[PDB]
Design an enzyme around this catalytic site. Structure first.
Site, PDB file in Angstrom:
ATOM      1  N   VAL A  26      15.788  17.703   8.430  1.00  0.00           N
ATOM      2  CA  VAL A  26      17.125  18.322   8.455  1.00  0.00           C
ATOM      3  C   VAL A  26      18.264  17.399   8.044  1.00  0.00           C
ATOM      4  CG1 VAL A  26      16.231  19.224  10.725  1.00  0.00           C
ATOM      5  CG2 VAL A  26      18.735  18.715  10.492  1.00  0.00           C
ATOM      6  N   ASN A  81      16.202  12.835  11.784  1.00  0.00           N
ATOM      7  CA  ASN A  81      15.276  13.937  11.484  1.00  0.00           C
ATOM      8  C   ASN A  81      15.070  14.043   9.981  1.00  0.00           C
ATOM      9  OD1 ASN A  81      14.115  16.630  10.891  1.00  0.00           O
ATOM     10  ND2 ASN A  81      14.533  17.034  13.076  1.00  0.00           N
ATOM     11  N   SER A 139       3.206   3.243   8.020  1.00  0.00           N
ATOM     12  CA  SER A 139       2.985   2.207   7.032  1.00  0.00           C
ATOM     13  C   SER A 139       4.299   1.807   6.372  1.00  0.00           C
ATOM     14  CB  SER A 139       2.073   2.804   5.956  1.00  0.00           C
ATOM     15  OG  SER A 139       0.733   2.908   6.452  1.00  0.00           O
ATOM     16  N   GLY A 140       4.472   0.526   6.219  1.00  0.00           N
ATOM     17  CA  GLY A 140       5.636  -0.032   5.536  1.00  0.00           C
ATOM     18  C   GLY A 140       6.829  -0.273   6.449  1.00  0.00           C
ATOM     19  N   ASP A 192       0.228  -7.776   1.881  1.00  0.00           N
ATOM     20  CA  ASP A 192       0.720  -6.390   1.821  1.00  0.00           C
ATOM     21  C   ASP A 192       2.243  -6.263   1.902  1.00  0.00           C
ATOM     22  OD1 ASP A 192       0.709  -3.582   1.821  1.00  0.00           O
ATOM     23  OD2 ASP A 192      -0.248  -3.409   3.754  1.00  0.00           O
ATOM     24  N   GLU A 202      18.670   8.173   8.014  1.00  0.00           N
ATOM     25  CA  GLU A 202      17.886   9.299   8.539  1.00  0.00           C
ATOM     26  C   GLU A 202      17.657   9.223  10.042  1.00  0.00           C
ATOM     27  OE1 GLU A 202      16.835  11.993   7.439  1.00  0.00           O
ATOM     28  OE2 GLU A 202      16.546  11.871   5.220  1.00  0.00           O
ATOM     29  N   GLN A 262      -0.663   4.756  10.644  1.00  0.00           N
ATOM     30  CA  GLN A 262      -0.333   6.106  10.130  1.00  0.00           C
ATOM     31  C   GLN A 262       1.042   6.575  10.612  1.00  0.00           C
ATOM     32  OE1 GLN A 262      -4.946   6.993  11.336  1.00  0.00           O
ATOM     33  NE2 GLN A 262      -3.421   8.680  11.390  1.00  0.00           N
ATOM     34  N   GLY A 263       1.539   5.796  11.549  1.00  0.00           N
ATOM     35  CA  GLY A 263       2.678   5.934  12.438  1.00  0.00           C
ATOM     36  C   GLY A 263       3.835   5.174  11.835  1.00  0.00           C
ATOM     37  N   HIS A 285       0.816  -1.227   0.000  1.00  0.00           N
ATOM     38  CA  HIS A 285       0.000   0.000   0.000  1.00  0.00           C
ATOM     39  C   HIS A 285       0.846   1.271   0.000  1.00  0.00           C
ATOM     40  CE1 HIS A 285       0.101  -0.465   4.551  1.00  0.00           C
ATOM     41  NE2 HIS A 285       0.525   0.831   4.342  1.00  0.00           N
TER      42      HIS A 285
HETATM   43 CA    CA Z   1      17.852  13.985   7.984  1.00  0.00          CA
END
Ligand code: CA
Length: 223
Positions: free
Chosen positions: A57, A54, A177-178, A84, A52, A174-175, A40
């Site tokens: 930034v 943040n 997905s994937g 899924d 990553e 929502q926190g 999805h």
């Molecule tokens: Ca970053």
């Protein structure tokens, strides 16, 4: 992630952000050239962001690589969210280091009561809207299938599991997905769905990766 904490920068080195002009989904790095995410999460023109913390930034550890190819599982049903899972090939290989690492595929399925690590960037509130810019973490057990199917009668298949708490309060949905669900150093889950977020007798629902390992290995080797 509702009801967790800040992972700490680069503590989840396999965590990926999928970017389409903005952060829209998570994923996991399974080798230098491949990512696994949810079906999805399919879009055209993905950029995969590694190392990553943040997402707003540039902190120095990032690797920004275009996806060359996406493969949604042949039997993905977007109505039921059954199967899924999606594989994303990187245009150039990732450079693996302390901050950017692969996660292993399971050799076996994890059992109920096994503690897992669920990470992601998404919505921290069960009511209302608040998106964090940092990688957040949650530790949650895998619930028993009984407890899972009771919460979502006639919705849960063999390719799903539930994790978290029956009381609510702590969940992903929502926190991200994937996003990954890692148990005893193996990738056991993918954040798929869950009705509302962190609701009482509504746990999260995860794609059961151990069912897919043969598909993943074959697909990656042939593509
Ligand atoms: Ca970053």
């Amino acid at each position: 992630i509702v009801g967790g904490y800040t992972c700490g920068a680069n503590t989840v080195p396999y965590q990926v952000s999928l970017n389409s002009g903005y952060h829209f989904c998570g994923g996991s790095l399974i080798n230098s050239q491949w990512v696994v995410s949810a079906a999805h999460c399919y879009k055209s023109g993905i950029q995969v962001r590694l190392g990553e913390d943040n997402i707003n930034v540039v902190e120095g550890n990032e690797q920004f690589i275009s996806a060359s190819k996406s493969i949604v599982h042949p039997s993905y049903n977007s109505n039921t969210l059954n199967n899924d899972i999606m594989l994303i090939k990187l245009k150039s290989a990732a450079s693996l280091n302390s901050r950017v690492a692969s996660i292993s595929l399971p050799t076996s399925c994890a059992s109920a009561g096994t503690q897992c690590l669920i990470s992601g960037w998404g919505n921290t509130k069960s009511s209302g809207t608040s998106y964090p810019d940092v990688l957040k973490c949650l530790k949650a057990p895998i619930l028993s299938d009984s407890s899972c199917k009771s919460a979502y009668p006639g919705q849960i298949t063999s390719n799903m599991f539930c994790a978290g708490y029956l009381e609510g309060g702590k969940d992903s949905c929502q926190g991200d997905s994937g996003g990954p669900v890692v148990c005893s150093g193996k990738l056991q889950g993918i954040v798929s769905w869950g009705s509302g977020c962190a609701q009482k007798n509504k746990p999260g629902v995860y794609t059961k990766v151990c069912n897919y390992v043969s598909w993943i290995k074959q697909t990656i080797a042939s593509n």
